[PDB]
Amino acid sequence: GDWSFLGRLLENAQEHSTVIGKVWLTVLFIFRILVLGAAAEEVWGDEQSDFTCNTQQPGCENVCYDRAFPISHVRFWVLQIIFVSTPTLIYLGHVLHLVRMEEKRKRIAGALLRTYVFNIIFKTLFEVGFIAGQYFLYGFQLKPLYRCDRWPCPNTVDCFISRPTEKTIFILFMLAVACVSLLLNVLEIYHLGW
Amino acid sequence: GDWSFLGRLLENAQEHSTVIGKVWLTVLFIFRILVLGAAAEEVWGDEQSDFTCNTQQPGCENVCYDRAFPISHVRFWVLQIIFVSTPTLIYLGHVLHLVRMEEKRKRIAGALLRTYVFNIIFKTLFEVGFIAGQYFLYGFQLKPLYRCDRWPCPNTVDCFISRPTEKTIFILFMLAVACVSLLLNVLEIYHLGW
Amino acid sequence: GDWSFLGRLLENAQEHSTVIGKVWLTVLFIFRILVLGAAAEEVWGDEQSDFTCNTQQPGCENVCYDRAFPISHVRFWVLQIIFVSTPTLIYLGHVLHLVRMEEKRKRIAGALLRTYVFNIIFKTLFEVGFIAGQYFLYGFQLKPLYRCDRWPCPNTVDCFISRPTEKTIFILFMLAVACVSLLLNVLEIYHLGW
Amino acid sequence: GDWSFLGRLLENAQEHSTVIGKVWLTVLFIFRILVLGAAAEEVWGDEQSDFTCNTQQPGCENVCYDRAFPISHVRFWVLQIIFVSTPTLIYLGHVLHLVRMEEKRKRIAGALLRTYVFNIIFKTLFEVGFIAGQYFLYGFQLKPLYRCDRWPCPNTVDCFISRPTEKTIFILFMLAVACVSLLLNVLEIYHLGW
Amino acid sequence: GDWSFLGRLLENAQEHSTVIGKVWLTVLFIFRILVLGAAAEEVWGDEQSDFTCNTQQPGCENVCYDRAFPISHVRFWVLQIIFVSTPTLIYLGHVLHLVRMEEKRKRIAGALLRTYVFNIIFKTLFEVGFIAGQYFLYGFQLKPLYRCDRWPCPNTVDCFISRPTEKTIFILFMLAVACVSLLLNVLEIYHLGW
Amino acid sequence: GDWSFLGRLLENAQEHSTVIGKVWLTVLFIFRILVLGAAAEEVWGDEQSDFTCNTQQPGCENVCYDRAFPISHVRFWVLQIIFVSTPTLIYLGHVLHLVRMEEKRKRIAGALLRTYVFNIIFKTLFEVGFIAGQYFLYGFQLKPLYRCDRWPCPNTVDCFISRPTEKTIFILFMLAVACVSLLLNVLEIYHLGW
């Protein structure tokens, strides 16, 4: 998609953020947004086209793909990116507001300190939450075979998924990127406190 | 699509708007435009391609998809974005006109105050209206099965929709974003009055 | 498509135009160009792919789609945009030429006044003309069923169109946008005269 | 495609050219490049996909499409644009070279006059030539039916073309644009001579 | 594809190059890169999709397309562009290095002269080489029929190619462009020597 | 995909890097990123669409493509580019941090020297590693035939790959580019030490 607006906002965040925060933003842009655009979106292009079920029942493939993949992985990662980014926008807005107020009348202390720490907190929580949701929804291994018993499918039908190994690889890659982001938030807290 | 022109106009609106207004515009750009471009448009890519009806009647799938989905959701959201944005453009134009007039001769009071409040009002009305239209047209749950009795379909035919669960998720996501926009307009009114 | 060049020219037109003219250009960019790019072009993507005729005759679907839709709607709107825009480019060029001449030697009167009024006139005429052509070619309701008797089709065949309801909606939307443009040209004339 | 580089060069040409030349370049950008990108390329998207021949012979559709359409129209127009543009680049380069030489040492006369006139000449010749080639290759009406007798086709087979009416419309549109370009070159010559 | 980076580098090369070199770069950008992007890539879009073999043997079309077209033409031209461009980048880098060194301490002679001449030489060699490779691999006429005897094909099968005439036209066009580039390099050498 | 952000970061790296480093970055941008975008991604577009297995077993093609190509080549190259780039970003960040610190108070020595050398080291290791992984996973020749015995396939089935020769060519091209990158890192080390 088009991430230019968010790109500008997060560059401005880089202008006003800790070094570890800059590392976090660079990770976000290179290892998550870029990887989705260049690589992952082409793996999931034929997710439903190349999803094959051994049946002659109309509508069984559709409902079985819907049950196998309620939300697609790529979409889930998109939402994860947006949500983990939002706190940074909040902090950047607080900063610009204080700057405008100073200008009206006539560098991390007071409200900025607290707000930044809270930003860190929320980023961490959201990240952990998406990780856990991904685990409980799919785990971290996409098996080639999916057995479906949803109406209109007669008895249990066997269905086969496109590119399970490649998808598995990218699932783990993005999970590792998320864990790196968590480590970076922890390091930022430590740096602040000491 | 290409939202760059609107992007520039709404950035200019950010230059001249309340803090809560800036939050509203950031929500608009990140949670609605971006989500449509990156995520939702790929969910609805195969809306009619993967729409399957259990019949051998030529033309039944077409008329049954037309009856099930008169306007697509993504298109409806596009129109919603445009319409909720228009008032902001009107207010921005009023502002630039007053600036040009001052320049000819030789900061929210008088006409700007009223016009801004009215902008808020219209944004709210339009938002609520689209929400209600969405509800009365589709509700907020897209069932996998759609039973169609429209000519040329013989008797009632069963038809099956692509990605009902994912579409349901995104419907609710966008509804929640709209409700957040409403809360923001209310907060802006309150801030003005007090 | 790519409207950037025209975008720049019409922004320059905004630099030199009446307030109502600025409103007209904003309408052009937001409600016509943007709507086509984001929404309408995806409705008409499968116009011929999902056009189904109940026959086993080779070539009947092609000739029946050609007879049903001689020019596609989206293409017609593209041409409408270009043509209604041209006068504005003519006026902008007259303006830049006078500016260059002043520069050589060493704000709406004389030739600029007349030329601007004529621009208005032409914009109006073209708009009305496209509206009427659209009406006489298609009307403003796209029926799902189209009965075709063109060779090689044997006797009369029934053919079915993709997304008739959505297309009908967008037809009316664009017609209303055109009528708004007409009202704006009328208002601009009135403002000039008084 | 991507016409940005050529766009920049021809904008520079506008910086150094007659008023009628500026009109010519605006015509080139709006009525030929833009129309191809936004409209014509979508008419010819399914030129071979929706080309249907009434036969069961493998390879007959391919050779019959190749014989019906040796070069596609859109490609022919692309080449026409490039070739009619080249002279303008030559003149612009002559100009920049003279400017650089003046700079080394320490507004249409001499070499610039001749070179510009010759540019006009070549533009005219190329235009007329492409027009005539288009006529002799296709004429200006694309008939729906094409009868093909090329091996491997057995006896004569009937083949049917996609969107003949729409293609016919756009053929005539582009021909009229080319004739307007010719009129503009003639007017430029007249302006120079008088 | 995206040629913007290379575009910037070669514009910088234009800043520091002979007039004939500027002509060469303009040829490169307009007649080779642009033609590929706008025109040729759409001719070769369905190279394998519309490649039809008269057989019922699974896998024969794949191996016969692979034997007929080991490397596609468009890809070959892409590589040709890259390779003929590289020397220019080398010369530009030599230039910028000398400029930086002058800056540290505190216009074609010495090392720059030799390096530029060598650039010319390499460009010529590479060009000639690609031309000859194209000839020995395909010649300059793409016949519609290709007879294939590669396993798993039983005996010899007849296979038919998409758009042979159009491809033939573009092959010759690009060959002529390459010969023009050669003439330009020769002219540049002559200009230097005299 | 979209490499603009990385492009900016690596341009900044060029601002602060050795000449051989600049050559390395130019190689990265021209011979790896550009080649993937313009050429390789179109070779691997139909990797699974045109993958044909001689069987009537549902799901055998999917599992046999997954076993033949666990990760696609293009995706592997994408990851290779990202990883070999990361060290350069680390070094650039170290540099900008030292610059900011100098600014607070009031050119390759100390920490910058070590960090740069380590960057070189890591780039080399990663490169070699990806090379070896590519070899052990696929080798450097993609055979047309792949024999598959994975469930649900009955006994051993023959499967055929799209464009094996072209893919083989590009595999070797990218391997040679990687070896050139290795030579450049070695040359940079030598230049530093002497």
Ligand SMILES: CCCCCCCCCCCCCC(=O)OC[C@H](COP(=O)([O-])OCC[N+](C)(C)C)OC(=O)CCCCCCCCCCCCC
């Ligand atoms: C503010 C934070 C709010 C958090 C709210 C959490 C709400 C949790 C509701 C718990 C209801 C559980 C009941 C249930 O769900 O019924 C079981 C059903 C799965 O059925 P199954 O066991 O057969 O396996 C499924 C196999 N299949 C994947 C092929 C289908 O559904 C599942 O378990 C899938 C559950 C997926 C949960 C996704 C949570 C996303 C959290 C995002 C947080 C973002 C923070 C900003």
Ligand SMILES: CCCCCCCCCCCCCC(=O)OC[C@H](COP(=O)([O-])OCC[N+](C)(C)C)OC(=O)CCCCCCCCCCCCC
């Ligand atoms: C300035 C504001 C003007 C507002 C004008 C509102 C006009 C309301 C006209 C009321 C006519 C009702 C009669 C009717 O419509 O016949 C019923 C028919 C649905 O048939 P059904 O009951 O079988 O279920 C349908 C199930 N199916 C979805 C699968 C097809 O159609 C429906 O109800 C669908 C109705 C959808 C209404 C959409 C309203 C959009 C408002 C946008 C506001 C924007 C403000 C800027």
Ligand SMILES: CCCCCCCCCCCCCC(=O)OC[C@H](COP(=O)([O-])OCC[N+](C)(C)C)OC(=O)CCCCCCCCCCCCC
């Ligand atoms: C400078 C201005 C010049 C204006 C020139 C106007 C020329 C008018 C020529 C009049 C000839 C009428 C004879 C005729 O056309 O035979 C009837 C035939 C339709 O047959 P049908 O009755 O069975 O229904 C058709 C149903 N079907 C749509 C499914 C096919 O064709 C039609 O009526 C369709 C006619 C469509 C007219 C489109 C006019 C566009 C104007 C654009 C103006 C732009 C200004 C800048």
Ligand SMILES: CCCCCCCCCCCCCC(=O)OC[C@H](COP(=O)([O-])OCC[N+](C)(C)C)OC(=O)CCCCCCCCCCCCC
């Ligand atoms: C520097 C200027 C050089 C100009 C060189 C002109 C060379 C002319 C060669 C004359 C040879 C004629 C013999 C011939 O060609 O055999 C006839 C054959 C058509 O067979 P057919 O009669 O059955 O109808 C064809 C029906 N079908 C279209 C469905 C296939 O081919 C045709 O006539 C098609 C001929 C198409 C000519 C295209 C000329 C393009 C000029 C571009 C100028 C650009 C200037 C910068």
Ligand SMILES: CCCCCCCCCCCCCC(=O)OC[C@H](COP(=O)([O-])OCC[N+](C)(C)C)OC(=O)CCCCCCCCCCCCC
């Ligand atoms: C630094 C410069 C290094 C240059 C190295 C040149 C190496 C030449 C190796 C010579 C081996 C010849 C043996 C051979 O190849 O066996 C014959 C076989 C073709 O079989 P066939 O006769 O049946 O016809 C083929 C018909 N079919 C196209 C449908 C398949 O293959 C062919 O001849 C096709 C040969 C294609 C050669 C392409 C050379 C590209 C040069 C690029 C230079 C770039 C400079 C920067």
Ligand SMILES: CCCCCCCCCCCCCC(=O)OC[C@H](COP(=O)([O-])OCC[N+](C)(C)C)OC(=O)CCCCCCCCCCCCC
């Ligand atoms: C920090 C560095 C960590 C490096 C960790 C290396 C871990 C190595 C694990 C070794 C396990 C070997 C067991 C195994 O794998 O079972 C054999 C199985 C292949 O079965 P097969 O023999 O039948 O042939 C396969 C033919 N087929 C391609 C059509 C499927 O799998 C294979 O061998 C394929 C193995 C592919 C290895 C890819 C390594 C990528 C390294 C990237 C380094 C990036 C540095 C930043």
